[PDB]
């Protein structure tokens, strides 16, 4: 159970994203990538918390911002394929 | 390094995404999730190939279609926090 964060500033590093979301609980993994769907320089990120309670705290807080962008964290539930 | 596929049909399963891209090369990992940025139903996908050469073959093909949707795979380079 991950959180997906779209619309990140190009200046947002994975450490920056980690630092923001660690205020809500223990982070198991935090990754950013440049969003390849636009030439506008922006990123998206995925945050994995150790405790699902942390997701509720994020979703409950009505305003989030990071590196001059208003962000809107969403839940994401990846489904992996088996080997062929 | 992964390929990002936006705009998947809601019907596209992980296995279908895997079977489509396996035509271009060996797969390390393949996942699908609901795109949480729309109220209607669509997916996005992430495919990790064993060999980057497979990415070139995907990028070079002019038209891709999966479960009746045009898809336009892009390259992505995830960076993890320390």
Author numbering:
A (entry chain A): 1 to 84
B (entry chain B): 1 to 82
How did the manuscript describe this experimental structure?
RNA-binding proteins (RBPs) play critical roles in cell homeostasis by controlling gene expression post-transcriptionally. It correlates with a poor clinical prognosis in multiple hematological malignancies.
We performed docking analysis to identify a putative binding region. Based on Ro’s ability to compete for MSI-RNA complexes, we hypothesized that the binding site is likely to be shared with the RNA binding site. Thus, we predicted a stacking interaction with F66 and R100 with Ro. Also, the K22 side chain and the NH backbone group from F97 formed stabilizing H-bonds with the oxygens from the aldehyde in the C2 position in the pyrimidine ring and the aldehyde from the opposite ring. To directly test our docking model, we mutated the putative interacting residues (K22A, F66A, F97A and R100A) and determined their ability to bind to Ro. Importantly, the single mutations did not disrupt RNA binding to MSI2 whereas the triple mutant completely inhibited its activity (KD > 50 μM). To provide additional evidence for the docking model, we performed NMR chemical shift analysis of 15N-labeled RRM1 and observed three main regions with structural changes by titrating MSI2 with Ro: (1) K22 region (with M21, I25, G26 and W30 shifts), (2) F66 region (with S61, G65, F66, and V67 shifts) and (3) F97 region (showing V95, A96, F97, and R100 shifts).
